[PDB]
Design a protein around this ligand. Structure first.
Ligand code: AN6
Lengths: 219, 6
């Protein structure tokens, strides 16, 4: 599906450089679902943060493919003492400082890196959130990145992937230079990283016309 | 973000 790997990455970088650093820019015209998205994410995550036996901590989270901080602002900062962000697009990290407002003072690092080149620091994160970005990595780079994420989790920490699933196979989007993979492909890549699947949910009440969205909690 | 089915 991906013929030229260098062009797969360079075309995506070029695409994102000219997108407006706004919520509707992040979501490709679907800004009107942002809060519906975040509310489901919060319910999916909060189970793991409950006092419980092996509770996931609330000290630090990493937001991967964070953009301007849409998720950091309304999902992660209210739940974690500190948040780090990583994104390839410099204009989005610059805008995040303004978009996040006062509570953005609790964002520690604004890492500018492609996930395929990024190593999260060992024993650093209670939650690593990876939303709407796995389609920008090749299958091998995705598996390798997920393995590096596993090494950066604190005790009881989790990785969450939330993304679009194709009906069947792998579909390349030539506009933004990303792939949409079917559920069985995604589950296979997750397993290959040595991650166990702890929770899984298809999101409800999104628009009829978009691909299904699944969330996976992993460790 | 989300994607309209192609
Ligand atoms: C919906 C697509 N996201 C928007 C931001 C965020 N995920 C959200 O609001 O839901 C795409 C983000 O992914 C960044 N990006 C593209 N490609 C990469 C790579 N290889 N590594 C890290 N980040 C990447 C985009 O810049 C965008 O912010």
């Amino acid at each position: 599906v991906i013929e030229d790997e260098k062009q797969f990455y360079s075309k995506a970088k070029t695409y994102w450089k000219q997108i407006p650093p706004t919520v509707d820019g992040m979501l490709g015209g679907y800004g009107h679902i942002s809060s519906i998205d975040i509310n489901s994410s919060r319910k999916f995550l909060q189970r793991f943060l409950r006092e419980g036996p092996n509770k996931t901590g609330t000290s630090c989270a990493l937001d991967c493919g964070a953009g301007i901080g849409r998720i950091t602002k309304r999902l992660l900062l209210p739940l974690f003492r500190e948040v780090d962000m990583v994104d390839i697009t410099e204009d989005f990290l610059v805008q995040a400082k303004t978009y996040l407002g006062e509570e953005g003072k609790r964002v520690r690092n604004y890492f500018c890196c492609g996930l395929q080149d990024f190593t999260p620091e060992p024993d650093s994160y209670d939650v690593i959130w990876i939303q709407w970005v796995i389609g920008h990595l090749t299958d091998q780079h995705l598996a390798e990145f997920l393995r590096r994420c596993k090494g950066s989790l604190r005790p009881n920490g989790i990785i969450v992937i939330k993304d679009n699933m194709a009906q069947e196979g792998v579909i390349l989007d030539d506009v933004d230079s990303s792939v949409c993979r079917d559920l069985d492909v995604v589950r296979r890549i997750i397993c290959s990283a040595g991650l166990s699947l702890l929770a899984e949910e298809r999101q409800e009440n999104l628009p009829d016309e978009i691909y299904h969205v699944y969330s996976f909690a992993l460790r | 973000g989300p994607k309209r089915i192609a």
